[PDB]
Design brief:
monomer, 194 residues, alpha+beta, Sortase, Chain: A, 8-stranded mixed β-barrel, 3 helices, 8 strands, 30% strand, Sortase family protein, transmembrane helix
Length: 194
């Protein structure tokens, strides 16, 4: 997007001392490991530290060719221009005992968004870029649930996950699709051409 060059650009213009301070806030917030009730996003300023040019980062999902900005909250306004972050879950900055949940409409006219998330397979990876850098996840579990079930979205102590959440079956949307990655080391030698 044009929206994510503006993110990339503004990040380089920020003192590290500041970037650090902002990340410290994010981590401290992420001790919400030690806790109440998520709201299925389809029916704030909590992430301000991470917010740069309106965005908390972008997510890159090579299998499906997406690089999509991430916005705080699940407000429909934002769910029209990218990925929303499910308030109540960890902020997408990784860490032991974190589980960030990122959600996005399927096949919106303005953007494809997560429309093709059914084509991600356990083993594929995705990446999150935030003020502090880039972190990598390898998909370890794909599963299908009813909209009122949230056990899978809570923090799993001692582990580091991000879940990508959308509705399914395609064009039916009766249930939700959860593509979950497990943190791995970020290795340049990241491959996008494949």
């Amino acid at each position: 997007h044009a929206n994510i060059n503006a993110f990339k650009e503004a990040v380089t213009k920020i003192d590290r001392v500041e970037i650090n301070r902002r990340l410290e806030l994010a981590y401290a917030y992420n001790a919400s490991i030690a806790g109440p009730a998520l709201k299925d996003p389809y029916s704030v300023e909590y992430a301000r530290m991470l917010e740069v040019k309106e965005q908390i980062g972008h997510v890159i999902i090579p299998r499906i060719n997406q690089d999509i900005p991430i916005y705080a909250g699940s407000a429909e306004e934002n769910l029209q221009r990218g990925v929303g972050h499910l308030e109540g879950t960890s902020l997408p900055v990784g860490g032991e005992s974190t589980h960030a949940v990122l959600t996005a409409h399927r096949g919106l006219p303005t953007a494809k968004l997560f429309t093709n998330l059914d084509k991600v397979t356990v083993g594929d990876r995705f990446y999150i870029e935030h003020i502090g850098g880039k972190i990598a996840y390898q998909v370890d579990q794909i599963k299908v649930i009813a909209p009122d079930q949230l056990e899978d979205l809570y923090v799993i102590q001692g582990e580091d996950h991000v879940t990508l959440l959308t509705c399914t079956p395609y064009m039916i949307n009766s249930h939700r699709l959860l593509v979950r990655g497990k943190r791995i080391p970020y290795v340049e030698k990241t491959v996008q051409k494949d």
